[PDB]
């Protein structure tokens, strides 16, 4: 499976001029503000993936904030508002145009309680993600193979999710729930930025 | 000064205005078991409408029409809870809101205490009295005590609103507000549809 | 308010010549197994009420026993599995006619998660309960008058709060769901003198 | 080597039912049955064979099913019949009024262990494995896979012999009126799950 | 193994002319006034074992129960907690010289929480003790080939532990500690029966 | 309320030639090996106490001594769980002839959950303790009169309360089980200062 | 005696002094979200400093100066907190400190209640109220309740210190205090850097 | 190479050396009642030394000089309890140490496994076996399992060390691991003091 490992940025859009784009990161841990952007993956949907590597103190990635800048591109992430954080964290832009598998699943899958993208994907495509380089060294000036791959496979099949999870909203009659879900995603990831990350806004305590 | 109405407001003479102050009482939180009993309305002039709902009732052409009305905000507290009940009963979504709670949670950021009453109190020297919290609200005649703590929930929204909004002003936290706001109407859809114990954005 | 007291039994039941009996117990403790009957509180609603001590080691109380038995007479408790349960266990007879406010109110009073009998009797009857003497020593000789009062009031509100409880359940249409409730509540109180008192039976785990 | 009869909407006939207890489950996409639709029946004589019948999307009727449902000559055996009457009522409108439950007869006489689910009880008293890979699964979907076919039918295959067994112990330890009070309230159990009261023990104190 | 397994009780007690015997029970359930006792397990520590189905309703063991109220035996148990009390509410005699495995365990091996007998055999003496049959119908007519190896299993080997606990008591200075808590071991058994299975009569709260 | 203050030790033991002591104990915590002993309460059950001001220390008191060493004095505790391990831990010696007012309680108040000292002195004996001092600099080199009548309090009624216990031991036959559970106290709170004190010892798991 | 001062000490001429009590209000408990709005200082004479801080404020010599003093003292309840927003906000973090918290939790082994009104309450019969913690202190003009629990939380520091410091020389632990004083600048850096909410001594 | 002694390291020929890496068994948790078992040294140079200690044994004066040695860090996984046991038994705290769980803690923000069998794979592909973990280390003679699983404790912790150092300065976080270094003994104090449930930073 073909993965291009970049240094900072991508080195053009060629392979992005498309209507929807598969983005994922990777990162020194689950807090924004202490834990670095380490890895930004990349995928077109056509079972390759771009894995760049985002040096500490990168301040910019311009072709790569054009993606997420581009509002006549869906960004489609795996619990994009873990994403949504770190990118905007990062380079100061927040996409607006998004779509999330795992809020998808909670839409969908309402027959399981498990929506981790390693589940989903076992399930819906008989594909296998190995986790065991989830928690490494992504800040390594170096990426292992392994660590390549996991990265890679994190984006290699949210076309294939999104095109069979949008069938289960139209099915439910979900699609509008979806979509105001999605539209709030960017802020909810703001939301954590802020300082609400481990609050429910809408909780009634 | 409480109007209490049969059904509906008989007309919409003292609601033309930029924003109301609604809030509902009901038999209980589960709005699919726990039918809606009473809607209260105020314009913030100090006075307020409570409309018993009966059991069965499908319409109510007046009231609804102002929760239609894109151009008046419907001002609640807490409206995750009231926008549910009021969708499901009459059919129809309010998207226009603006909710005292997620304003306090988004600028009282001192205190973990957003309910209603600490919010009168802290804001307004105001004294909610919650007694009447938990009564019969489909009774078909209304204490005295329950219509006052009805109208004491709308009496005060516009008020506090007005202080909210400066501090969602001070503290640069008005686009943020206005997101959660857009939002409420469809996180009170997806409680009616079934997830109303999930935080639909939470990782598990 | 009359509170007639007796040792062991009532004299006679001229009395309860009536279609509904108001009855409570007071024993040393919630185990029946362990904690023996001490009282038995009967009222016909007309504001008297009857209270009995029961001697450790009685086995037998004949008119009690048959008003307890007597299919045409609707025996009111709150929370009548504790009650059922003790006078089961200590007479040999389980009631199998009955009414439970406290189940009622869980079926009606949906607007609170409160169902004590003080918090019922101060919402629909205006009327105070006071729970100072719930424990105490019941096996005492001699109760005193406040051990007395708060049996008898345990019994006094019954049927007026039936009466109310019964019109909610009416309105909101959930009359044929209590009666399966209520009817259920002997073989309730069965299972838990059986070995079951920490299970709830109809649940998944 | 088993044979399992796979049907849309409803059985053709009630040929293979005229029997004294008939046993039934459901398959759904989850476990709110105001939300989450009813997808599949099935139901087994105890005959080693099995009926699989989709339930469509809005599907209102099916006769011969309910039939069997309403029949009070018939007793409905279940595991955890709570969760499917409660389903079965909310889809057809018709609460079974006869009906036996293996998790509670289990509850009722295994109580020498804390695990009542249906694989272990299978396990135990016959040595037979359930495989509860398909449990969460896509069960609205158009054609079931023969894993999910495999699964549903293997939940109604062995109830005729579990009743069976737990009759046994309900009459040495003397429970058989116990049980029989149980199963006759189950009904308006999976009733008050409908209605609200589905995270209520409605006997319990607090 | 040598099993012997018997109806009722012992034929004579041959094999139990010693000082103290291994003893251990099974039953349908930990409830002991719902759940009857249905196997009583001996050994002498020879590597034999005696396994005494006990049917429903019994009230006699003659021999059994002269072993377990002769004061020159010590009775070995296993968490004998559950063992004493079964015993004393089915043959109205409570043994009172005992030695408890688990009680050793809790009191030796400080350097672990796992007391399970299980865990015990295999750490002290490398003897793998199968659970498989522990939940298991008891009261059947004819135990299985499995079941009658699991109850031997938990008698086989208690005197070979006692001895190396033993040995740890008296390294670690804690034998006066330990003959105490058997000393009250079986009122603590008695506690049980009578209602306060649930309590630590000797916490604070 | 005659409350004589020592320093030490009593002068003597011309007030305690009687066949019971009630005793009570403050320290620095709850924490025997941290938190010094800092007083001894001592009553004759005559209304009157000795409040024994123990130095940073000190390691003997040859009259107090004397009395919780004495066979033919029973001294009476309210969860003397505690009063034992200190007091063993700084004098080194444990009394073994014991009466717990909390135990006794647990084993005849089965009406209720509330065994702390002030209620029982509330229900039995219409006796008002007030916990204001409980949590008090008890090593301050001269007591306020306040704490001085707190420590008084915990010794003045126990006497009494022990009376009505023994009653109620009596009347619901359960006798030899609270003397059993007595006899092991002492070892129990060896245990805990052993370092048992977060173990019940006798628990399953 | 309270003096309120807008953005900083006048002068130094009260803190010619060995240490001096510390407090901060503040719009909530996450210094990254919640910005400094009050300092409060007192010698310990009885009278006290109440300094409101501005949105934005990025300085204030005076007191910065006194928070630079190695020969100065620097006395807090729960300091943790205080040291972390006010290095935060100034960029200086204090290094020579006492806490009256630690020190009670060091000390004061006979209950589980150690905020500073309990102590308050036990060691000096002095009743502090809690109503005004909970308030808006980032308003332009603080209340006179609001002024004076500012001022209340370190008016009785250095009575507080004194007796703690007794109680550790009694009980023998003063090197363990100033150990745990030592790091405490530290554990308030660990707070701002992510680990606000860890351990960093636990096993687990 | 394992080398086994009976009470103390005949000698320190082996330990001329900056750092060495330190282990401890014993009979379990609670240094006041389970007494030091095993004592392990390495000085990275892939041999270890596994010291018995006999019940009451009061001396071990090569191993001690080590401790004390200011000029040699004693690095741990986990110190808080070596420490404390160390202390405990022979009456001296080591005062210059290194811990690399309080390092993991500090550089591993991407895991929250930080005991030493997860680091060790992760860090060096090393597998360490936790099967004699509970095990009876007062035996007179240890099994060879025994003696394996403590000298893999100290074999890995040079190796260790330099990687966390890496990552201290790459992240740089030097002087906060230096810090928390520093109280590390005082921590381990405050266990044997009656604190080891205890967080002393904790506001509760």
């Not at 390759?48 to 054009?66: E, Y």
């Not at 969908?108 to 065991?132: M, P």
């Not at 909810?188 to 305590?205: K, M, Q």
Request: charged share 25%; net charge negative; proline share 2%.
């Amino acid at each position: 499976t073909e993965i291009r490992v970049h240094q900072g940025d991508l080195p053009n859009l060629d392979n992005y001029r498309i209507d929807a784009v598969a983005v994922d990161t990777e990162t020194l841990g689950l807090q924004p503000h202490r834990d670095r952007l380490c890895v930004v993956q990349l995928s077109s949907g056509d079972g390759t993936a771009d894995v760049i590597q985002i040096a500490k103190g990168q301040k910019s990635a311009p072709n790569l904030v054009r993606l997420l800048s581009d509002r006549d591109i869906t960004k489609i992430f795996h619990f994009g508002r873990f994403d949504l954080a770190i990118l905007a964290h990062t380079f100061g832009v927040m996409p607006d145009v998004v779509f999330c598998t795992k809020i998808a699943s909670k839409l969908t899958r309402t027959y399981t309680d498990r929506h981790g993208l390693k589940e989903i994907c076992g399930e819906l495509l008989n594909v296998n993600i190995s986790k065991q380089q989830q928690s490494s060294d992504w800040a390594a000036e170096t990426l292992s193979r392994a660590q390549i791959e996991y990265a890679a496979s994190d984006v290699l099949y949210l076309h294939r999710l999104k095109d069979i999870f949008e069938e289960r909203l139209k099915r439910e009659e979900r699609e509008s729930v979806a979509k105001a879900c999605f539209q709030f995603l960017p802020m909810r990831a703001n939301l954590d930025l802020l300082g609400w990350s481990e609050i429910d806004i809408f909780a009634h305590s």
